[PDB]
Structure 1
Amino acid sequence: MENFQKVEKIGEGTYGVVYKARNKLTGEVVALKKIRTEGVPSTAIREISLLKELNHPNIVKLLDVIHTENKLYLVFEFLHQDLKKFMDASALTGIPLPLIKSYLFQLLQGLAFCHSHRVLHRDLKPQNLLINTEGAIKLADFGLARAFGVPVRTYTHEVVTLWYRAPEILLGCKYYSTAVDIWSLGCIFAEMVTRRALFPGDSEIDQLFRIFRTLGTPDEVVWPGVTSMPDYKPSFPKWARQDFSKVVPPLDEDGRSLLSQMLHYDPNKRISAKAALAHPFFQDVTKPVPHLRL
């Protein structure tokens, strides 16, 4: 506000609205998130500070945080396109495997970094993965479910995407672990490969059941303790696990192996970002430049 000239509304994110803006003084171009109010947390405003010092090449830089006039502004380094747009633009031919692999690899580095600093993203999706002309991809819009929790929607009547939500969140787990980010990234990896959302649920239960229909209804054997989770119902339909080869054709076996590990039901068996970086799938990783139309 006042020190910035809104150039264009980029989107209506989760907590607020996001604008492309220019610092009327420095002339620097940035992404400005405006947050939705008579209290304002402290554990939050300090969860923010931790994010400011959280600097990594695969994490969008948080430049400034401005709390004024019952509004909270987060100033981020600006990137030119999100992965959702890039995937749509590449739908006819598909993103070449080397670029998919590079993006996945960089995103795992970003996650390995935040997770080692005990920071969870919580809401990874194509729209919050930003890319630039140099072939980089960065994590954006980290969620503070440990600050603003997660109400009925985003901030003003808008359908929240559940497509990338880990099963343990859907089943009512109160405490998320870093594993929820691995699950979301696995769903994104699959989507880049097939050019179709892996689990496109339109409600929590439909989301949950689409996961069950593909990976099999979980039980105590593959997920110890699953039947005692908050929203688990013995009445859940029992679907058999589908052949994984039908899930992401024509991804090679290394890629399928890695994906299967990112999609393990048990949060404790799900591969970590660090371990995923060492998977054979990345033996030939490179950093190609994407063809971006801006």
Structure 2
Amino acid sequence: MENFQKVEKIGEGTYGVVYKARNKLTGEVVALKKIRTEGVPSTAIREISLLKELNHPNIVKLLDVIHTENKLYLVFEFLHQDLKKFMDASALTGIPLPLIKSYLFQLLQGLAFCHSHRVLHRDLKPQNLLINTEGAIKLADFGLAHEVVTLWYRAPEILLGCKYYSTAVDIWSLGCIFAEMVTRRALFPGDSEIDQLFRIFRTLGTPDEVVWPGVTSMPDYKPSFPKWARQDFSKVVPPLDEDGRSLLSQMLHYDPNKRISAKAALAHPFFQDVTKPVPHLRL
């Protein structure tokens, strides 16, 4: 862009590469995402056209949208770090619970907002969650629909072939991220769809018509799936207190309909003593 200069390469996203650009006119630092082009669908550009209005304190703000020379550029506000990085940086001691509680609360607020507007993220993960020195965390890289995208945060209904999945898939993803912050280890680190699915089955037990009505009708559901029993949560996410564990199990419900909503989660007693701490960030 004439008014932008790639100051750095933040990294390749899901929809294209992300560089740290400096706006030559306003002298501001932004996150420039180069979107992948053989014409660029007019229906897609209209979808992104809405996004600029979807403004929430917990959503990385989309500053502008440049569609020049059939090339699509998305300029976002620039945050200083992602949650994945922050966690690796806290691996020795682990993020303090008050911070974990604050980030979860904020993300639930953001999700509650998107969801009330019929918008799903679809691919929530640590790397898509941006944070700042102020202590805020935001949703980024929404699913606006050659590495190795992880399936670790993928909901079971998606892995089983459900096309019209709901906003519940985001709650599942956030539930996996929540558990990860607390234990400092991914909940379900699958390396293949089938592996991902079975690691989930081995922890929450293989779902059936009892815990998940209609499950045996899923497209990729095989009657030949191994039959695992459910594991105790006290063993799965220690040392999360009962309140935390209670909320987590509700976010990890098999039946998308039984899965707790973002707004409902906000009212959970776990956030009764929620505060907004400031992180010890290293930039």
| CA shift for structure 1 position 2 | 2.5
Query: Could you tell me which residue of structure 1 aligns to residue 224 of structure 2?
Result: 235
CA distance in 2, matches of 1:101, 1:40: 41
Shift of 1:42: 2.7
Q: How much does 1:70 deviate?
A: 2.8
Percent of aligned positions with the same letter in both sequences? 100
Equivalent residue number for residue 94 of structure 1: 94
Q: State TM-score, norm by structure 1.
A: 0.95
- SS of residue in 1 equivalent to 2:227: coil
TM superposition shift of 1:37: 2.9
Post-superposition Cα deviations, 1:109-129, rounded to whole Å, max 9, x if no partner, equal 000000001111000000010
Q: Distance in 2 between matches of 1:162 and 1:4?
A: 34
What is the rounded CA distance, in whole Å, between the counterparts of 1:44 and 1:172 in structure 2?
24
1:228-275 alpha-carbon deviations (Å, 9 max, x no partner): 011000011110011111110000000000000000000000000000
Deviations 1:186-224 (A, max 9, x none): 000000000000000000000000000000000000100
Count of paired positions: 283
CA distance in 1, matches of 2:106, 2:198: 31
Report the Cα offset of residue 40 of structure 1. 1.9
User: 3-state SS of the aligned residue for 1:99?
Assistant: helix
Cα distance in 2 for partners of 1:176, 1:94 equals 33
Change (3 A) 1:230 1:210: same
Contact 2:10–2:18 (CA<8 Å) still a contact in 1?
A: yes
Residues 103, 137 of structure 2: 8 Å contact kept: yes
User: Deviations 1:7-39 (Å, cap 9, x if unpaired)?
Assistant: 111110101000111001101110011011324
Q: Distance in 1 between matches of 2:70 and 2:149?
A: 24
Shift in Å at residue 41 of structure 1?
2.1
Deviates more, 1:66-75 or 1:23-32: 66-75
Q: Secondary structure at the match of 1:31?
A: strand
Moved more, 65-74 or 252-261: 65-74
Deviation string 1:79-133 (CA, Å, 9 cap, x unpaired) is 0000000000000000000000000000000000000011110000000100000
Aligned counterpart for 2:174 among listed residues 185, 197, 207 = 185
Contact preservation (8 Å) 2:40, 2:71 = no
What SS does structure 2 have at the residue aligned with 1:198? coil
SS in 2 for 1:130: strand
CA distance in 2, matches of 1:57, 1:80: 16
Moved over 6 A (4+): none
Partner of 2:183: 194
For residues 236 and 43 of structure 2, the distance between their equivalents in structure 1, rounded to whole angstroms, comes to 41
1:17-74 Cα offsets, whole Å, 9 max, x none, are 0011100110111001101132422332121122110001000100111111232100
State the distance in 2 between where 1:167 and 1:39 align: 35
Aligned: 1:49 with 2:49: yes
Instruction: Supply the RMSD in Å over aligned alpha carbons.
Output: 1.2
Maintained 8 Å contact 2:56/2:113: yes
Q: What's the secondary structure of 2:52's corresponding residue?
A: helix
- Which stretches in structure 2 are left out of the alignment for 5+ residues? none
Alignment partner of 1:174: what SS? coil
Looking at structure 1, the residues matched to 87 and 123 of structure 2 have their Cα atoms a distance apart, in angstroms, of: 18
SS in 1 for 2:18: strand
